[PDB]
Amino acid sequence: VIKVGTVAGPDSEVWQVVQKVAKEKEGLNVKVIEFNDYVQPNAALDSGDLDANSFQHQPYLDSQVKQRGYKIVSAGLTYISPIGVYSKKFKSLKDLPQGAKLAVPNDPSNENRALLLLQTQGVIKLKAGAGTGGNNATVLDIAENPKKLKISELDAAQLPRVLSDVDAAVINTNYALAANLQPTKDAIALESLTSPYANLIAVRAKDKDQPWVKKLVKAYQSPEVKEFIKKQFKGSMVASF
Numbered sequence: 001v002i003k004v005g006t007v008a009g010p011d012s013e014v015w016q017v018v019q020k021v022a023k024e025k026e027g028l029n030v031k032v033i034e035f036n037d038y039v040q041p042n043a044a045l046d047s048g049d050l051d052a053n054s055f056q057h058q059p060y061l062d063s064q065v066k067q068r069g070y071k072i073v074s075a076g077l078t079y080i081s082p083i084g085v086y087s088k089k090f091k092s093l094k095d096l097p098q099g100a101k102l103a104v105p106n107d108p109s110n111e112n113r114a115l116l117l118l119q120t121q122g123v124i125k126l127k128a129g130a131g132t133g134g135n136n137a138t139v140l141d142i143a144e145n146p147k148k149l150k151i152s153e154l155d156a157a158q159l160p161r162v163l164s165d166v167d168a169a170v171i172n173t174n175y176a177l178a179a180n181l182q183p184t185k186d187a188i189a190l191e192s193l194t195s196p197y198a199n200l201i202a203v204r205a206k207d208k209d210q211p212w213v214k215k216l217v218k219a220y221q222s223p224e225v226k227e228f229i230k231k232q233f234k235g236s237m238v239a240s241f
């Protein structure tokens with residue numbers, strides 16, 4: 001019995017399809033264990049409670065390894081989902097008022113990612129080398145902030161639920177979709193597909209060469225799953241296979 005941890009929302013939806021493919025094509029018995037946010041699946045994998053997880057990109061895994069020394073590696077890529085900026089109050093970042101309130105994720109890699117997107121969009125400039133080379137930028141690394149934006153750093157999962165009280169927020173696509181935001185229609189700015197944020201299936205290092213691993217990855221990287229991703233998420237998630 002293969003226990004795969006994932007985050008409730010689009011990932012869990014995809015995994016219902018993968019579960020079916022894994023059984024029919026690979027003879028695997030997959031159980032999908034859902035988590036509400038990003039915090040626990042690596043710890044649960046490290047401890048043996050899971051056999052794999054499928055919720056993160058490589059910069060996130062790298063950050064987690066730096067923090068906890070997890071012996072966890074990628075077994076293969078799943079999809080990429082360009083992060084968007086959302087607003088209930090403005091149609092463009094150019095419309096932000098003086099002293100506008102923004103919210104971004106507060107974990108090292110996604111906070112860095114959000115600040116880079118804001119930099120790309122010309123809203124801010126980070127201090128030299130703050131967000132590159134593996135370094136992660138925070139709001140304290142902002143060198144230029146012409147509009148004197150007030151940037152809150154909040155838990156990634158909470159961001160959709162503060163939209164009424166900020167002028168814009170940078171929100172991970174899994175959470176945006178779960179909150180009925182559509183990245184291809186509602187976002188006022190969007191990250192490029194040429195980013196390092198493809199998501200992945202992670203397993204314990206010691207298990208990386210087990211036969212079930214390649215079989216599981218094959219089940220995910222299947223025509224059925226690609227078709228589901230295309231149809232269900234309308235281009236906000238792009239298969240990485």
Ligand code: MET
Nearest residue numbers: 038055056057060172174
């Ligand atoms: C936990 S790292 C972020 C994962 C999320 N699915 C994203 O691609 O934005």
